[PDB]
């Protein structure tokens, strides 16, 4: 859907750590009235957990990331990011990112250990 | 999860028309950083829609719905509505609520016909 969003990112680490997802437009996105990443655990819905509000710049987290992830973008490199910190095996899930107008990133696995 | 969601309204509308979708909360829910409406067309991927933002009580909506739609919640009542105007066929969808903490609503669906 007119921008395109290549995802990169994840992986697997230890409960208590951190990773960061990236996801890389194929052009400006910041006129995107919302920007952000969402959540898909195996036998549930996907879920919004962070986004940055298209003009004003403010940012809003669901309760269960709130203080541990926080969502950056760059307008220069036109990359959003989550950076996840104090990583539980609760967070364990597929991420994606989407923007307003915007096509979906693929899918990445986060995997947090015991 | 903790607070139970009861989804009601939708239907079938003529384009340009109007249809309201309530949300009746079993327990205040004002507290959630993420009080939203996602939408879920066919072959696609649940997207959010709208969202009050728990605390400054502002607002969000995805480019293709904002002007048209309006998200409120009554405290009172412990109700979220999303008042959906000047519909098109492309707003055909099953339509969801969710707030931070709480359980999903069931979704409703709303068919916009020519």
């Known amino acids: 859907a007119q921008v395109q969003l290549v995802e990169s990112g994840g992986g697997l680490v230890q409960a208590g750590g951190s990773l960061r997802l990236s996801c890389?437009?194929?052009?400006?996105?910041?006129?995107?009235?919302?920007?952000?990443?969402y959540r898909q655990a195996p036998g549930k819905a996907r879920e919004l957990?962070?986004?940055?509000?298209?003009?004003?710049?403010?940012?809003?987290?669901?309760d269960s990331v709130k203080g541990r992830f926080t969502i950056t973008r760059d307008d220069d490199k036109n990359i959003l990011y989550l950076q996840m910190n104090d990583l539980k095996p609760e967070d364990t899930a597929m991420?994606?990112?989407?923007?307003?107008?915007?096509?979906?990133?693929?899918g990445t696995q986060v995997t947090v250990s015991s | 999860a903790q607070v139970q969601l009861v989804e009601s309204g939708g239907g079938l509308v003529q384009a340009g028309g109007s249809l309201r979708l309530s949300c009746a909360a079993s327990?205040?829910?004002?507290?959630?950083?993420?009080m939203a409406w996602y939408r879920q067309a066919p072959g696609k991927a649940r997207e959010l829609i709208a969202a009050?933002?728990?605390?400054?009580?502002?607002?969000v909506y995805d480019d293709s719905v904002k002007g048209r739609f309006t998200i409120t919640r009554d405290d009172d009542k412990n109700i979220l509505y999303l008042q959906m105007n000047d519909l098109k066929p492309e707003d055909t969808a099953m339509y969801y609520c969710?707030?931070?903490?709480?359980?999903w609503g069931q979704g409703t669906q709303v068919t916009v016909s020519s």
């Open positions: 009050i933002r728990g605390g400054d009580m502002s607002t």
């Open positions: 327990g205040s829910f004002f507290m959630s950083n993420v």
């Open positions: 969710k707030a931070s903490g709480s359980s």
